[PDB]
């Protein structure tokens, strides 16, 4: 019953820092590496499934999440914060967009909505910031493909390619080396896999790696035929098997 801390828990310090936002960023550093690479005809988001137990079933925990049929997200930092951000993000895409315009939000707008949700946790009374950074990749008719990073402060930035979390500094270097503007999606998935191998401690296979693409429309994933102007999701989670095929040619 009733909150006592109706004041901001993120305040400015004598030097101009916002401590809690700094400390959430330090949490993102401690988290498992995730990355995004933009190609000419798609985006790839990838991360490692770091398991709590060998007795756990890692298929039941998705780090990669569909946000709308053409937008997907991955994170580094505190898992549960991600999970609830994903719920709010899906809802907001409906309440603030689809229920109004009859179509799904373009990438930047949804990212902007997510940013707002995180911005608020930085200003409101009696809350800490979210302990995550997200990578949001998507497609829309008028903007093409995009990749955005969203930070605990509420800040977002568009990226050609980037990595967040543990090995992020080395992985970002490995991406500046490898990225160009002629990359096909298949090349990008291949680079994503290479970059992720430096980060992975243990086994590196389709069971321990999580990887999704924003590529082309998947009419077989639509669930109905008949309406010719509805072609299906561009978001697609690659299977364990699919990953392994690209590791034997890696």
């Amino acid at each position: 019953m009733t909150d006592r801390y109706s004041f901001s828990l993120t305040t400015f310090s004598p030097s101009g820092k916002l401590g809690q936002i700094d400390y959430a960023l330090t949490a993102v550093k401690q988290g498992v590496t995730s990355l995004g690479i933009k190609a000419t005809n798609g985006v790839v988001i990838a991360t490692e499934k770091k398991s709590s137990s060998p007795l756990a079933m890692s298929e039941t925990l998705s780090k990669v999440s569909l946000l709308t049929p053409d937008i997907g997200a991955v994170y580094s930092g505190m898992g549960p914060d991600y999970r609830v951000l994903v719920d709010k993000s899906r809802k907001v895409a409906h309440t603030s967009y689809k229920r109004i315009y009859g179509e799904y939000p373009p990438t930047k707008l949804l990212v902007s909505e997510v940013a707002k949700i995180m911005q608020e946790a930085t200003q409101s009374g009696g809350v800490r910031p979210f302990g995550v950074s997200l990578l949001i990749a998507g497609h829309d008719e008028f903007n093409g493909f995009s990749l955005y990073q969203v930070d605990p402060s509420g800040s977002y930035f568009p990226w050609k390619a980037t990595a967040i979390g543990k090995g992020s500094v080395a992985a970002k270097t490995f991406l500046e080396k490898r990225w160009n503007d002629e990359l096909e999606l298949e090349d990008a998935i291949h680079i994503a896999l290479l970059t992720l191998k430096e980060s992975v401690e243990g086994e590196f296979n389709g069971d321990t790696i999580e990887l999704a693409i924003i590529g082309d429309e998947n009419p077989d994933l639509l669930g109905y035929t008949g309406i010719p102007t509805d072609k299906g999701p561009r978001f697609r989670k690659l299977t364990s098997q699919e990953i392994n095929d690209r590791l034997e040619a890696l």
Partner: protein
Amino acid sequence: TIFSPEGRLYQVEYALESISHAGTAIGIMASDGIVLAAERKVTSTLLEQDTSTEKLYKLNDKIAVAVAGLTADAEILINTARIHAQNYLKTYNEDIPVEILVRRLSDIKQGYTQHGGLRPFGVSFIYAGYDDRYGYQLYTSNPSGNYTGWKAISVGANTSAAQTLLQMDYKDDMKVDDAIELALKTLSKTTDSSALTYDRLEFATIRKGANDGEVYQKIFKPQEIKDILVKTGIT
């Protein structure tokens, strides 16, 4: 919110401290247009330049802001400024006079300074607008909610150094093209980077609609910034 023994607002002071670390933003007003230039926060090769707009935002068709500080705070404020412009247009069938919009934004900032025990917004704005009462205008607003009018002004880092230079080379009878040169010269001199290159820059103007009688905002594409950077002899 509370006062200090000195009669200062701690949180406001520290918010202003924060801003003095943000990439410098310059605004210069000329008789036939207005210049907005700002420097991006030490970037990376992999940062998408074409689909990026972190420091310059359109408010309505006749007003823009340059941002210094927390972007996420600035987006909150920009969005409400956008609504205020649309409310005024709907009420009066006239585009909002520039000052009225600036005052309103400023008043929202003042509020977080006086009640509610929330942190202030860590944002300073330079407003660049045109209306049919005062013509071209330039305003500045900081986390205190204070606002002032200018002919030339900077926010963020090195305002101290940038202000002295603008004071030196600013002359009331300038054309826009002269103000463009001044803004880029001033950024170049004050930068903590080596060369001031296109990819570290956001740039915009408000002119007299190429050839018309109407007012037009140009938010420079990256390529345009590279050209205008060779022209003024910084390559």
